[PDB]
Design an enzyme around this catalytic site. Structure first.
Site, PDB file in Angstrom:
ATOM      1  N   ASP A 210       8.437  -7.613  -3.458  1.00 17.05           N
ATOM      2  CA  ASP A 210       9.096  -7.211  -4.707  1.00 17.05           C
ATOM      3  C   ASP A 210      10.520  -7.072  -4.399  1.00 17.05           C
ATOM      4  O   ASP A 210      11.164  -6.172  -4.960  1.00 17.05           O
ATOM      5  CB  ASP A 210       8.469  -5.946  -5.099  1.00 17.05           C
ATOM      6  CG  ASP A 210       8.841  -5.579  -6.898  1.00 17.05           C
ATOM      7  OD1 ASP A 210       9.252  -6.710  -7.432  1.00 17.05           O
ATOM      8  OD2 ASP A 210       8.240  -4.569  -7.296  1.00 17.05           O
TER       9      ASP A 210
ATOM     10  N   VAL B 102      14.385   9.956 -11.808  1.00 22.35           N
ATOM     11  CA  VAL B 102      15.657   8.933 -11.399  1.00 22.35           C
ATOM     12  C   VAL B 102      15.324   7.649 -11.781  1.00 22.35           C
ATOM     13  O   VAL B 102      14.131   6.986 -11.734  1.00 22.35           O
ATOM     14  CB  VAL B 102      16.012   9.077  -9.682  1.00 22.35           C
ATOM     15  CG1 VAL B 102      15.332   7.980  -8.757  1.00 22.35           C
ATOM     16  CG2 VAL B 102      17.258   9.630  -9.351  1.00 22.35           C
TER      17      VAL B 102
ATOM     18  N   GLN C  70       7.209   7.677 -11.128  1.00 20.86           N
ATOM     19  CA  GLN C  70       7.607   9.123 -10.924  1.00 20.86           C
ATOM     20  C   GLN C  70       8.157   9.386  -9.466  1.00 20.86           C
ATOM     21  O   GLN C  70       7.828   9.830  -8.482  1.00 20.86           O
ATOM     22  CB  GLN C  70       6.160   9.997 -10.818  1.00 20.86           C
ATOM     23  CG  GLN C  70       5.611  10.051 -12.191  1.00 20.86           C
ATOM     24  CD  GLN C  70       6.304  11.343 -12.897  1.00 20.86           C
ATOM     25  OE1 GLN C  70       7.018  10.886 -13.970  1.00 20.86           O
ATOM     26  NE2 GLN C  70       6.354  12.451 -12.744  1.00 20.86           N
ATOM     27  N   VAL C  71       9.666   8.839  -9.512  1.00 21.54           N
ATOM     28  CA  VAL C  71      10.446   9.017  -8.552  1.00 21.54           C
ATOM     29  C   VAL C  71      11.601   9.688  -8.912  1.00 21.54           C
ATOM     30  O   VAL C  71      12.066   9.571  -9.973  1.00 21.54           O
ATOM     31  CB  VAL C  71      10.799   7.422  -8.233  1.00 21.54           C
ATOM     32  CG1 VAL C  71      12.127   7.417  -7.176  1.00 21.54           C
ATOM     33  CG2 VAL C  71       9.749   6.607  -7.304  1.00 21.54           C
TER      34      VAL C  71
HETATM   35  N1  LIG Z   1      15.493   5.742  -2.370  1.00 28.40           N
HETATM   36  C1  LIG Z   1      15.936   6.088  -3.922  1.00 28.40           C
HETATM   37  N2  LIG Z   1      17.166   6.600  -3.765  1.00 28.40           N
HETATM   38  C2  LIG Z   1      17.829   6.521  -4.788  1.00 28.40           C
HETATM   39  C3  LIG Z   1      17.434   6.194  -6.130  1.00 28.40           C
HETATM   40  C4  LIG Z   1      18.313   6.188  -7.247  1.00 28.40           C
HETATM   41  C5  LIG Z   1      17.902   5.260  -8.469  1.00 28.40           C
HETATM   42  C6  LIG Z   1      18.650   5.423  -9.658  1.00 28.40           C
HETATM   43  C7  LIG Z   1      19.482   6.270  -9.865  1.00 28.40           C
HETATM   44  C8  LIG Z   1      20.284   6.526 -10.976  1.00 28.40           C
HETATM   45  C9  LIG Z   1      20.087   7.536 -11.667  1.00 28.40           C
HETATM   46  O1  LIG Z   1      20.395   8.727 -11.382  1.00 28.40           O
HETATM   47  O2  LIG Z   1      18.981   7.686 -12.689  1.00 28.40           O
HETATM   48  C10 LIG Z   1      21.769   6.296 -10.577  1.00 28.40           C
HETATM   49  C11 LIG Z   1      22.588   6.038 -11.792  1.00 28.40           C
HETATM   50  C12 LIG Z   1      21.529   5.156 -12.669  1.00 28.40           C
HETATM   51  C13 LIG Z   1      20.434   4.997 -11.902  1.00 28.40           C
HETATM   52  C14 LIG Z   1      19.721   7.342  -8.723  1.00 28.40           C
HETATM   53  C15 LIG Z   1      18.975   7.145  -7.654  1.00 28.40           C
HETATM   54  C16 LIG Z   1      16.089   5.658  -6.110  1.00 28.40           C
HETATM   55  C17 LIG Z   1      15.348   5.749  -4.733  1.00 28.40           C
HETATM   56  C18 LIG Z   1      14.088   4.846  -4.641  1.00 28.40           C
HETATM   57  C19 LIG Z   1      13.619   3.776  -5.462  1.00 28.40           C
HETATM   58  C20 LIG Z   1      12.409   3.192  -5.525  1.00 28.40           C
HETATM   59  C21 LIG Z   1      11.496   3.863  -4.863  1.00 28.40           C
HETATM   60 CL1  LIG Z   1       9.898   3.150  -4.683  1.00 28.40          CL
HETATM   61  C22 LIG Z   1      11.629   5.545  -4.152  1.00 28.40           C
HETATM   62  C23 LIG Z   1      12.895   5.820  -4.161  1.00 28.40           C
END
Ligand SMILES: Nc1ncc(-c2ccc(C3(C(=O)O)CCCC3)cc2)cc1-c1ccc(Cl)cc1
Length: 284
Positions: free
Chosen positions: A140, A18, A25-26
């Site tokens: 951060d 994501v 590695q999320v």
């Molecule tokens: N808790 C979360 N929930 C959702 C996300 C997340 C981030 C980006 C996307 C997009 C994608 O699908 O690529 C959507 C469209 C473009 C970006 C989708 C979902 C990330 C985290 C998260 C962040 C930081 C950490 Cl350390 C742990 C978890």
């Protein structure tokens, strides 16, 4: 005790990485039984890191039970053969709409409406207030670490070792130089970062974006406080930016004081903005 942590095998399924690699590695994860989505942070575990990771899980466990902080679900270990290395999965709330940075980049001209900036800023401040009450510094704050759900709910992620990251949101006191040899994080450092995040929402990028990260790190403690380029903004918004970006943290206002700022406090279209944001999300 990590021995109590189960294998994620028929519990959580990894879908895809994501963001990109913003968080590393999320992963977008799926709860196998309900199909409910989760965010899964994957990290390799060594015998030495067993107490270094035990506190990160405990940090998520204790402080994520606030509406403006992405909620902790659980922890799992995906074991490896005797020749190492074990994998720890940290399962969290999935904020499906991505980050505030994604929101600005997906808007025409890469700018956000002042009432959208005020709404998101107050949700950042409310999440920080919860951490600061519990004596925790996020460390951060930036657009990438401020996430949105499908319902336009604002949630904070990645709160707190080998690499120095991106400098653009760093408060002057966290950067070591000749006058400041012991660069210290104060609760007020999160407020400077919040102000930079507010310029990022207004301009589509933080103030020294055009500089090499090494040059930006050099300039943040020497340059006067950053300012908004346009004059189109209200007196209330410039005052909020000025409040967050007090150069010397000793005269910088507290999170509670910034929550009482007219730009954050006075929000009549609070319900209207939430709808406009939800509508913008629907346009995937
Ligand atoms: N808790 C979360 N929930 C959702 C996300 C997340 C981030 C980006 C996307 C997009 C994608 O699908 O690529 C959507 C469209 C473009 C970006 C989708 C979902 C990330 C985290 C998260 C962040 C930081 C950490 Cl350390 C742990 C978890």
């Amino acid at each position: 005790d990590l021995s109590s942590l189960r294998d994620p095998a028929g519990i959580f399924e990894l879908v895809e990485v994501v963001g990109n690699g913003t968080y590393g590695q999320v992963y977008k994860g799926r709860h196998v039984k309900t199909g409910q989505l989760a965010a899964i942070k994957v990290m390799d575990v060594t015998e030495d890191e067993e107490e270094e990771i035990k506190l990160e899980i405990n940090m998520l466990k204790k402080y994520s039970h606030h509406r403006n902080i992405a909620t902790y679900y659980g922890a799992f270990i995906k074991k490896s053969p005797p020749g190492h290395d074990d994998q720890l999965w940290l399962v969290m709330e999935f904020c499906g709409a991505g980050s505030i940075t994604d929101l600005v980049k997906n808007t025409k001209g890469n700018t956000l409406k002042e009432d959208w900036i005020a709404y998101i800023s107050r949700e950042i401040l409310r999440g920080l207030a919860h951490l600061h009450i519990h004596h925790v510094i996020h460390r951060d704050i930036k657009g990438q670490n401020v996430l949105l759900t499908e319902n336009a709910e604002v949630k904070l992620v990645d709160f707190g070792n080998t690499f120095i990251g991106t400098p653009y949101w760093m408060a002057p006191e966290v950067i070591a130089c000749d006058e400041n040899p012991d660069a210290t994080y104060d609760y007020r450092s999160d407020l400077w970062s919040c102000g930079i995040t507010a310029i990022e929402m207004a301009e589509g990028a933080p103030p020294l974006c055009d500089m090499h990260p090494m040059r930006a790190l050099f300039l943040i403690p020497r340059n006067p406080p950053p300012r908004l380029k346009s004059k189109k903004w209200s007196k209330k918004f410039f005052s909020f930016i000025e409040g967050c970006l007090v150069k010397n943290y000793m005269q910088r206002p507290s999170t509670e004081q910034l929550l009482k700022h007219p730009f954050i406090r006075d929000q009549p279209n609070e319900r209207q903005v939430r709808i406009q944001l939800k509508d913008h999300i629907d346009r995937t």
